[PDB]
Amino acid sequence: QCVNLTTRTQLPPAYTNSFTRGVYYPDKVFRSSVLHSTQDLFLPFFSNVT
Amino acid sequence: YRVVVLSFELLHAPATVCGPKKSTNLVKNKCVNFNFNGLTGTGVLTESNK
């Protein structure tokens, strides 16, 4: 039914730095020359990646 | 008993399902109310670029 193809070698991963990501318009509406606050699902300005 | 429940939503997003047709015309520049895309209001209409 199934064939097992696995190896006994495993290596731990590593992390790296990541700068400003996770900026997107909260809603489909349009705004011009206005500063607006929001509270939703974003990603911080300084983070790590793997 | 056969039960069916309709769950609407009026979020601040462009509607996609709308009342059957009910379309008449546009207007260039007059003080006339509008009911565009489930968004109703009153004012004068002008042409601008964005």
Swiss-Prot record, chain A:
Query: What's the impact of mutating residue 39 to H?
Result: In strain: Omicron/EG.5.1
- Provide the residues annotated with a glycan attachment (glycosylation): 4, 48
Q: What does this protein do?
A: Attaches the virion to the cell membrane by interacting with host receptor, initiating the infection. The major receptor is host ACE2. When S2/S2' has been cleaved, binding to the receptor triggers direct fusion at the cell membrane. When S2/S2' has not been cleaved, binding to the receptor results in internalization of the virus by endocytosis using host TFRC and GRM2 and leading to fusion of the virion membrane with the host endosomal membrane. Alternatively, may use NRP1/NRP2 and integrin as entry receptors.
Q: How does it assemble?
A: Binds to host ACE2. RBD also interacts with the N-linked glycan on 'Asn-90' of ACE2. Cleavage of S generates a polybasic C-terminal sequence on S1 that binds to host Neuropilin-1 (NRP1) and Neuropilin-2 (NRP2) receptors. Interacts with host integrin alpha-5/beta-1 (ITGA5:ITGB1) and with ACE2 in complex with integrin alpha-5/beta-1 (ITGA5:ITGB1). May interact via cytoplasmic c-terminus with M protein. May interact (via N-terminus) with host bilirubin and biliverdin, thereby preventing antibody binding to the SARS-CoV-2 spike NTD via an allosteric mechanism.
Listed name of the protein:
Spike protein S1
Query: Whole protein: which stretch is covered?
Result: 14 to 63 of 1273
